[PDB]
């Protein structure tokens, strides 16, 4: 067989009566989840995977763009000098798992090597009819509600020697982040367990040291649109933007409580789908609360550190294909002959 590009279909456990928008979308875009999921191990088979060049990622991006365009309608769209107005009702918006499945004539191969970094040969391969269920969570900096690594933190990068390449981190132990807009209406905050977060950075440093045996520094974002300089996400149908300086401000040499992140709810946002701004209605009243798992990170490594005893990493993101890649890295589509 051979790698191929096709249109995968999607499956989900959506319900007809839910007005939550992922359910509504999946009701017409997907089939019910597979009643009979089977993995078939391929004996003695080796296969090349590349999470960074994977058309599954490209289709998922297209699909979640259509989900958002149908679901979260802004009052006004500012694409170019133009202005496009429409009805702007508040909605229930909470991701559900979506599976991607092979059409007839095709197969999805799955890397079963738990230590696979995302690019290169995999010695332990199976065939599947569908991926696992993936929540299409849109966020920057912190990856939420995703899959976890089994034994140790994973550092995934097309080539980490190249400072222009995005770094996707996968955690082993999830870290709860709890965000609240209490009953100024735009003001909110996120809480993170300090001990857990510090243990998380320790584990991440341990793996990064395998690539750079140096002092490892975490520093905050140093530029870009608000969406990428903050941890942005949505909750309760509202868009949150959280300062992550208190998460990314530490130095870890070879040796010798609660973190509070302030947040703001924005009405003016930069679309991730395409270039342009969108305006949404002022915030709903009442209490808004989201409790999520941090399961990964998107990082950038400072370049040009010509002769330093340290490497510096900062939170990054913005290309949501990196979010889809963090889940789809172990899959590829092939045409069976």
């Amino acid at each position, epitope marked *: 067989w051979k790698e191929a590009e096709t249109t995968l279909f999607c499956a989900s456990d959506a319900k007809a009566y839910e007005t939550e928008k992922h359910n509504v979308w999946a009701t017409h875009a997907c089939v019910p989840t597979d009643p009979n999921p089977q993995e078939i191990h391929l004996e003695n088979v080796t296969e090349e995977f590349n999470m*960074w060049k994977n058309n599954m990622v*490209e289709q998922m*991006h*297209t699909d979640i763009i259509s989900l958002w365009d149908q679901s979260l309608k802004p009052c006004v769209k500012l694409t*170019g*000098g133009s202005a496009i107005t429409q009805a702007c009702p508040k909605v229930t918006f909470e991701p559900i798992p979506i599976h991607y499945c092979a059409p007839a004539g095709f197969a999805i191969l799955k890397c079963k090597d738990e230590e696979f970094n995302g690019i290169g040969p995999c010695k332990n391969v199976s065939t599947v009819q569908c991926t696992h269920g993936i929540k299409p969570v849109v966020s920057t900096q912190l990856l939420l509600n995703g899959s976890l690594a089994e034994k140790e933190v994973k550092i995934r990068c097309e080539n980490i*020697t*190249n*400072n*222009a*390449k*995005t770094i996707i981190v996968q955690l082993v132990n999830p870290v709860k982040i709890n965000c609240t807009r209490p009953n100024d209406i735009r003001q909110a905050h996120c809480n993170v367990n300090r001990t857990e977060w510090n243990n998380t950075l320790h584990q991440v440093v341990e793996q990064l040291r395998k690539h750079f045996n140096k002092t490892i520094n975490f520093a905050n974002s*140093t*530029g*870009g*649109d608000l*969406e*990428i300089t903050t941890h942005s996400f949505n909750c309760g149908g509202e868009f949150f933007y959280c300062n992550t300086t208190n998460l990314f401000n530490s130095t870890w040499n070879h040796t010798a409580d609660t973190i509070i992140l302030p947040c703001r709810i924005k009405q003016i946002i*930069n679309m991730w789908q395409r*270039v342009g701004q969108a305006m949404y209605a002022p915030p709903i009243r009442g209490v808004i609360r989201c409790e999520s798992n941090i399961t990964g990170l998107i990082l*950038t490594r*400072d*370049g*040009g*550190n*010509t*002769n*330093s005893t340290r490497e*510096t990493f900062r939170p*990054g993101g*913005g*290309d949501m*294909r990196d979010n889809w890649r963090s889940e789809l890295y172990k899959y590829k589509v092939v045409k069976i002959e």
Partner: antibody
Amino acid sequence: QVQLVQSGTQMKEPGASVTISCVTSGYEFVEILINWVRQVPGRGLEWMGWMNPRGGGVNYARQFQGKVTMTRDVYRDTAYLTLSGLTSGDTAKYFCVRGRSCCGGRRHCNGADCFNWDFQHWGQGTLVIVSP
Amino acid sequence: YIGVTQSPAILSVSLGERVTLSCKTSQAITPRHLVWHRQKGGQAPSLVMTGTSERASGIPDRFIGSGSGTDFTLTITRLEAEDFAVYYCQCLEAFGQGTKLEIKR
């Protein structure tokens, strides 16, 4: 044809700020990382940083952190370099520059997908002279 | 950070001569990552080689790129007047300090 065209020579007093523009044409601006390179007269090439025009994310060389700001206006196909707290050490020629494209007409294109460092298309350079 | 060293910094050469420019990386690299540029009179540099050995647009076949590991070379088989310039190797964000071709007398 791809073209990067920069603003003209500037003279600035010490302590002042300066902004250099880099207006691009002949390709999809938002799809390719912009880099800036400094060259003090008579000296070698020094990479300063890159900026992703999609979202405006940046990466600055340590030597220039606190000195440089790299921004863009996507609607105007223009990248900017701003230098703050000017000193005599900042007198130099500044180039905007981009490497080869990689998207190959695929549906979704981001500059971070490319190699970046096969620098191919340069602006003509902008001289900044720091003097009171 | 992988450093780049170019030495000699000045080569004194003559028309018609075979000239060898050297570039050394501080650790081993893939040849995919080594680039050569030339610059005349402080104007915008222009591309000579990418991926160690593939000639850029407009570059004639008297320019030959080779090397692997940490040691890379740009060879000009027969020097012409238009070839006199400063040549820079680039590896990722790092530049060498340049080699200037000068007229021997």
